[PDB]
Amino acid sequence: KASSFDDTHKLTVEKHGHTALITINHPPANTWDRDSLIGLRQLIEHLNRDDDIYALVVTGQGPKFFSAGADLNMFADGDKARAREMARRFGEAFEALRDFRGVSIAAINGYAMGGGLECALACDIRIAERQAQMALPEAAVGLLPCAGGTQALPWLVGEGWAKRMILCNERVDAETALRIGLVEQVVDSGEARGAALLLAAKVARQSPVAIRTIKPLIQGARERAPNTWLPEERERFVDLFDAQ
Amino acid sequence: KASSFDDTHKLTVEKHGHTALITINHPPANTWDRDSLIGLRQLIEHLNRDDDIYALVVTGQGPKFFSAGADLNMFADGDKARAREMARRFGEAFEALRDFRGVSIAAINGYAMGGGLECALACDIRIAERQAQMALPEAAVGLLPCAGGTQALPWLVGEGWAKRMILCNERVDAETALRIGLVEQVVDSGEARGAALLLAAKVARQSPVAIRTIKPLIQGARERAPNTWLPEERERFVDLFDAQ
Amino acid sequence: KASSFDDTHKLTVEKHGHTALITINHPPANTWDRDSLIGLRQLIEHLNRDDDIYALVVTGQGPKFFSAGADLNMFADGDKARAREMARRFGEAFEALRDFRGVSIAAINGYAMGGGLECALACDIRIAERQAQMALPEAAVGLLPCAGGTQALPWLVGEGWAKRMILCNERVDAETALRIGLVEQVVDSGEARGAALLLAAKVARQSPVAIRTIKPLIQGARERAPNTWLPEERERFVDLFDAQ
Amino acid sequence: KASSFDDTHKLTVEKHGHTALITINHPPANTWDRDSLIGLRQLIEHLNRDDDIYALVVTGQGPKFFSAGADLNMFADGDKARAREMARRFGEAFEALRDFRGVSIAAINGYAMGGGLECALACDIRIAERQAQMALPEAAVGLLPCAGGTQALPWLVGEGWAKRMILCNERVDAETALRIGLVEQVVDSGEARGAALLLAAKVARQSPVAIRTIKPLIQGARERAPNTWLPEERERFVDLFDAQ
Amino acid sequence: KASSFDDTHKLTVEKHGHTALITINHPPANTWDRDSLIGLRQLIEHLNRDDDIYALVVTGQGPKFFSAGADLNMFADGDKARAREMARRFGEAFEALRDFRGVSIAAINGYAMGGGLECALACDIRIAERQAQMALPEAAVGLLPCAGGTQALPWLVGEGWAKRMILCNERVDAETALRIGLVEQVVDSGEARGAALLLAAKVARQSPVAIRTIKPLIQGARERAPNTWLPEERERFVDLFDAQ
Amino acid sequence: KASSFDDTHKLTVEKHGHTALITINHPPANTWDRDSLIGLRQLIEHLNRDDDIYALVVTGQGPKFFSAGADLNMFADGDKARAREMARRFGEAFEALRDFRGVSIAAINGYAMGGGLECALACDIRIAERQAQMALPEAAVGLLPCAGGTQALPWLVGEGWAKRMILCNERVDAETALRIGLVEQVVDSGEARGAALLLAAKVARQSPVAIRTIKPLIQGARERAPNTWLPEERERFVDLFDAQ
């Protein structure tokens, strides 16, 4: 899928059924840069226009790294202007992945730190390998998680654990992540990608138009309290009842 | 309790102390229909006007089903008009049960799927039997949980598990439900009703006027961020200090 | 730290590195009164103006009590006027502790009930000893948790467990608290203070200006939905990139 | 209307068609006290249960005063406890009048100052006599408009004029009030009551069930942004289409 | 503009510079029906993809009617299903016109009642002819303004005048509309279209990319309080500073 | 007042009673630059710590310009980094002036365009001279009002007139500004400063502690719907009743 456009070779896309497998391919640490952040946004835009795609899996190339976060080549020095543009690209890329019209599954096959973890927080579901370690260590260098980490992390794991990770710089492993809600499924070494593609196959058995309508409803509390969406819930239910 | 009005025989009510035991009695699957959804709303309205009632337990008649959700007799065919009215009745019935002035305890004695699960999400506390299985499989038929499921489920279990259940159609058992926050207590087969009635007895030992005032405060985040309620919290605290 | 001002001897402060150790010293139950609630607010105000302080630990003097909540000497009788002023002092003291510019760690060394538990909910992180028991039993005397308990408790543990504690008056121990998210770390008897001071030392290794900026961002959902803060997140990220 | 219950002789009620004419009768200044604030809330509760009442007019007895605000007999001295209870009674009385299920019309026949003005802000529509003068002069005695004035006044007239009245203690006459949106219609001396009863007669020509449903929708922005109500608008539109 | 697609002859579109002139052409009263509501949404979608279009004017064909609101052919009888679909089409058509990426100007050349008025409320700016009369008389037939009228009308004119129009069924003329904020400019008979096209020409002198970015910011209070957008304001300001 | 610190000679401060008269002194157009935006924030910080100051007037030196907005020396070229810092300084300076603890009065003595108008929108009350002209013409150069103009302007004048000014680049004079709510008082040439200082004297007759408490309440709708502040209103009313 994404068969043709200027897609960076740092992001490989393969079609497996109704599922798009995205692999971060940037050695040695599967780090995110400008080229890949631009390609990610564009790629999500085309997958939202591909009606053959009901699901999405992203994972890191190789067995060691899911993603080590932001390249150092970007928050270089130095340039104040670079930093701002880079924070922009992270938001645009990960908000787009967040707004994927199907379901997105993060197959955490290793270290997911900083921006790599924020990328997985951007996905709908996370599947981590037993040895995987995740953290947001930006405060250690006087910075912060600018790709949504300050909001997404406490959203799943709660404020206590979120500031244990960000404010105290403590990393967590897959089994601790499962205990606190950061991940939904722990699997053995080398089983995330596979596990993710198989969970992405269960989605292709559901009505795609129902998935696309339901998902924004589930994320409703991210912009507005849940009770404010209940009338909208019935309305989209009737919209789904129409057209069988 | 609810000693006299036109209450459908599909909903049996028995008074045990300061507790109203509601039993869904609609074989074979304790399914919800129009008659029972109307009776539920009306029943909650009278229990809110009965000052002898401090608590509430709902459970499914029989050992197999808590509730299998919406009757097929309602989202029949077909009629676009039926579907809309039915989504309305679900909201009105379960929002009323949600707005019960005392505490409500769901004693999940079996399958609670779709609308049956939304009914239990409407209650304050859930107690599940070990063998009980719960899901929201509406997306499998191109529909959605229209009785609050798209908001209530992620509210307790988080977005990851909520779309694991809704978007991926994966069901969960009582022990998984406990791990993710969907239920608060797991008990052995045939022990939910009993467990629920005994938890409903601890409530009758607390000031009822304090329960009625406190409960809306606890649900405050469902309509508005928690910090916006703090001045209101002290105000209702003084209201409780008045009248001893 | 807090080396000089009128600080009540009911609140002892000792400086350990970049960490301020606050100890509730009011026998026999480390109860909160007017004098201590005033001193707490004032103390947090000076710690926010002490740039030598990056973290904060509060704990109860002695091995038995963290804090038994509100003194009876305050919600005395009786005076309607007293009650209101007291609810005010709780809010002001614990909202200030909540708004501490560094990280605050509750070292629960025993019973933390009512206002004592609300004090620990006010802190960023909670570390409980195995034998510690926590509850909000205000509804048992016809009152309510007026120091933020009705909002803070469901915020961490969810609505089900929050009303299990408040509406049903059921207390929880440290291992149950860990299971539900009320605490982040369980430790053995006599190890909380120590554990807390060592977690407070990891914070002094991070940029303080990053901690002060990040923490309000993490608590953003308490006043406004998380998505509304994302542009602000990047903006404060660039503010942190400036000044290296 | 309100034909029988313990209604204080300080509040006279007369039935004119489908309209309830409420007259503040407390010389010399039509001031609000505890007895009248309690009676007002109770009176609105019964008018909401009287299906013969589609509209409501309140005005001051005599030609000189609509209402001079709060009695001095209440924020007496002195008692801290009195003040709090009194602020409570104002809110409860005027929020109830605000939540009247039909339309309420303030016929301002004279001075409406402080609580008298807040009473008229509580009504749906205001009709002022040419000589009428309105202000919120609470800040002049070190207090504030505690019956909703700090929110209702800028809601209609804008922040500039609202703090011109409250923060600068400047009063306005009926013609200035019309220019800024504080009133909707200016009439000649002795014509407000009459004008109000005739506007209240136009309401009795509309579907009452439509008025009761529509009015909360119009006030939707007072609790939540307008766009959040649009799905609810259609839903209540279909509810009105049902039952013809 | 909109040079080619299935556009209903009930909606005529002509290109005048960078401005699209939309004319409701449905005698005798320029009423809105299903065919025209579908065409309106589609038309706005294509104008948002036409980079040659910076502005938009809608007006009624003929000198007598701007729009008399909803056709009777739709809320026919009767069918409950029809009513719901029709409320849906109004929302979708007018929310799209509301979300036009350029500026939209309503040239009110006559009666604009009910849905016709809601259509003009959907536009950015309103220019009314002296003889034009506007109202929302839905409550007179037991219905309500389902195309946003219950939210848009008080948004501009305030609650008092909004329920004077809706709850009391009182219509307003162009000079009263100007006094209350319902319209921004009053012009003489036969001068609205012309006035609107000339105001739409001033827009083509501004940066289009600035108009598209600014307009959502101006409407920010419709979904969220204004202070929550200020960081976003600077961010889009820098986005505009980039690309010159 | 502001008797001693590094205050830029571009901002002259004179003490007249309990009022601080701030005069933008930067020829020829009273334009805002970095030096003056920094000094403004600092100046407001010290006036908030001066208990001798109850009010504030800002106006432009000379008879021709109130303020022509942002210096060209700042959004120079060119530097992307400059633009961002400058948008930051505007927000910080005008949000501080907005958050002045007393009342602030803009005495518009001439042109107030772009940032000059945003400065006056930041004040509580605006008094304009008859010849004064105001606009936000940023969209004409492909930019936007980054100092709050996109939120403050529609907040007072409504969306129609706000986008008439911003999206259509149409300027308004003092008499049009009065008609639409942009200003509260129009005065003759050379009378604004004087008028403002005399309105600032009426404020010094009110309780300062009441002004400081009330003003945030009036601006409550800028961050949260008005109904959410009503319990807080009574609470601060009792806080004002305490301490006489």
Numbering used by the authors:
A (entry chain B), B (entry chain B), C (entry chain B), D (entry chain B), E (entry chain B), F (entry chain B): 9 to 252
List sentences quoted exactly from the publication behind this structure.
In P. aeruginosa, the gene PA0745 encodes a putative crotonase, named dspI, which has been shown to be responsible for the CDA biosynthesis. The structural studies confirmed the catalytic features of DspI as an enoyl-coenzyme A (CoA) hydratase that catalyzes the dehydration of 3-hydroxydecanoyl-CoA during CDA synthesis. DspI is a α/β protein composed of six perpendicular antiparallel β-strands surrounded by eleven α-helices. It can be divided into two domains: the N-terminal spiral domain (α1–α8 and β1–β6) and the C-terminal trimerization domain (α9-end).
The proteins were crystallized in two different space groups. The P31 form has six molecules and the P6322 form has only one molecule per asymmetric units. The atomic coordinates from the two space groups were refined at a resolution of 2.10 Å and 2.25 Å. In both crystal forms, the first eight residues have not been modeled because of the poor density in this region. The C-terminal segment (residue 252–272) is further missing in the P6322 form. Hexamer organizations could be generated by applying the symmetry operations in both crystal forms. The hexamer is a dimer of two stacked trimers and each subunit possesses the canonical crotonase fold. Although the crystal soaking and co-crystallization did not generate the substrate (or analogue) that bound the DspI structure, the 2Fo-Fc difference map around the active site in the P6322 form allowed us to model an acetic acid molecule in it. The hydroxyl group from the acetic acid points toward residue Glu126 and Glu146, implicating the possible binding pattern for the 3′ hydroxyl group of the CDA-CoA precursor 3-hydroxydecanoyl-CoA.
